């Protein structure tokens, strides 16, 4: 019953958010490969800070989108407007230009997933938060499941016909998506927000920060006209902004696996590495969902969030270990003989050596995801306040970006002259004379602190 009735809305929303992540993935899976094959033909630096600009201006855009969707405007209006922007945005390509482009589809997506999860949490809000976290399971398979389906369907009906449907792909979808959530609000109901109040509470947090500059900030506020709702909002964002900072080297981590574990498999369509991982995680949450929940509901054994965050980062560790030893065994295979091999135009030097062996380290990545991200997520709209629910999700994605840029800089910190750990990197192969292994191992010890400091963080805040 807790599922019943609202199914339809509910089911619509996740496909919304198929339809958006697949646009999205589309975009991202050949746009350097797209500039650089294009007649006008930039350099291979201008396209990678292209692509790098397009990511932080997505990643800084959520706050953002967060707040114009809670001030001045509602959630589905606010989702509404940024997806047409992303329709509009998307328009261009198909078709100075280019930046206006990529501006209009950043804020668009930006706001899009800053907005998303909320909307569909409140949506199944009446229930306990076991709906929730059951949307929450589902919404993260919906995604893997619209990732694979645009990273397959665009190499499918690439080849059929002109490669310019195959940027106008995308495009379609995001117009279903739109005409799909615009049936969905003539029957939604789904106890609409209707943010007007919660403008002032903006000011209200300004004026607590003046508090602070003119338990020290709960007494101040008793005397004041600090009404105790906004005091408690404020003390908790105060106890959540930790949370986020000890996450943002697990991001980095994070971001950092996915690309090398990619790089890896290179020497053992070039997307589908990356489709691995989220097959496995198609396979992944139906099963948990149906039986690694029940059981410890029969033996109350439901932990907090940050526990399972902390299981995640646990299973983090371990597939970097893996990693690392699978690296040592290729390198001390592959001093006696390599093979040739051709990925789309590149030419690749492999070990002699089958590629499943990276199925144990990425099935890790994968219980590791569907223990800690999800999980992540139900802590991000639990703990945050019922009014800037969607300012909270943008500052995470944004810390999640940052986390992402701090990883890129330590990638490209571990390859000075002094570390020596890779030369060929510049290259675009023969990784054969590098050190990946050791970058494995510092990346497991890295994981292993930050998971020591998490739990730390996560015992510190469960006492209080």
């Given at each position: 019953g807790a599922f019943a009735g609202r199914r339809a809305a509910c089911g619509a929303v996740l496909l919304t958010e198929l339809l958006e992540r697949a646009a999205f993935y589309g975009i991202t899976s050949n746009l350097v490969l797209f500039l650089n094959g294009a007649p006008f033909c930039w350099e291979g630096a201008q396209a990678s800070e292209a692509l790098l600009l397009f990511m932080g201006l997505t990643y800084l855009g959520s706050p953002f989108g967060g707040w114009l969707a809670d001030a001045r405007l509602g959630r589905a209006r606010a989702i509404l407007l940024s997806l047409a922007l992303y329709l509009l945005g998307m328009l261009a390509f198909p078709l100075p230009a280019t930046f206006a482009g990529l501006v209009l589809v950043g804020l668009g997506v930006a706001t899009v997933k800053a907005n998303i999860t909320p909307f569909g949490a409140d949506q199944v809000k009446d229930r306990g938060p076991e709906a929730t976290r059951r949307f929450f399971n589902w919404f993260y398979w919906s995604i893997n499941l619209g990732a694979i389906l645009s990273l397959g369907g665009i190499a499918y009906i690439q080849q059929n016909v002109s490669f310019v449907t195959g940027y106008a792909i995308p495009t379609v979808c995001v117009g279903l998506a739109f005409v799909v959530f615009l049936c969905g609000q003539s029957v939604f109901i789904t106890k609409p927000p209707d943010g007007s109040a919660f403008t002032d509470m903006f000011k209200i947090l300004t004026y607590s920060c003046c508090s602070q500059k003119r338990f020290d900030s709960c007494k101040m506020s008793h005397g004041g006209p600090f009404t105790e709702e906004k005091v408690e909002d404020v003390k908790a964002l105060v106890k959540i902004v930790p949370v986020f900072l000890a996450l943002i080297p697990y991001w980095t981590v994070y971001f950092q696996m996915q690309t090398t574990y990619v790089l890896q498999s290179l020497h053992l369509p070039a997307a589908w590495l990356t489709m691995f991982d989220a097959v496995l995680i198609l396979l992944l949450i139906p099963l948990k969902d149906k039986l690694v929940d029940p059981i410890l509901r029969r033996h109350g054994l439901l932990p907090s969030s940050l526990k399972r965050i902390a299981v995640g980062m646990f299973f983090v560790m371990c597939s970097a270990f893996a990693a690392g030893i699978l690296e040592s065994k290729r390198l001390n295979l592959v001093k006696e003989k390599t093979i040739n091999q051709t990925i789309g135009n590149v030419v690749y030097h492999a070990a002699d050596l089958s590629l499943w062996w990276q199925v144990p380290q990425y099935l890790l990545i994968g219980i590791s995801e569907i223990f800690a991200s999800i999980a992540g997520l139900e802590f991000a709209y639990s703990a945050a306040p019922k009014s800037m629910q969607s300012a909270i999700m943008g500052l995470f994605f944004f810390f999640s970006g940052v986390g992402s840029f701090v990883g890129s800089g330590l990638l490209a910190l571990v390859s000075i002259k002094a570390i020596g750990?890779?030369?060929?990197?510049?290259?675009?192969?023969?990784?054969?004379?590098?050190?990946l292994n050791y970058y494995f191992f510092l990346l497991a010890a890295i994981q292993g602190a930050t998971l020591l400091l998490f739990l730390i963080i996560s015992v510190k805040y469960d006492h209080h």
């Open positions: 750990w890779m030369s060929s990197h510049t290259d675009f192969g023969n990784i054969n004379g590098c050190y």
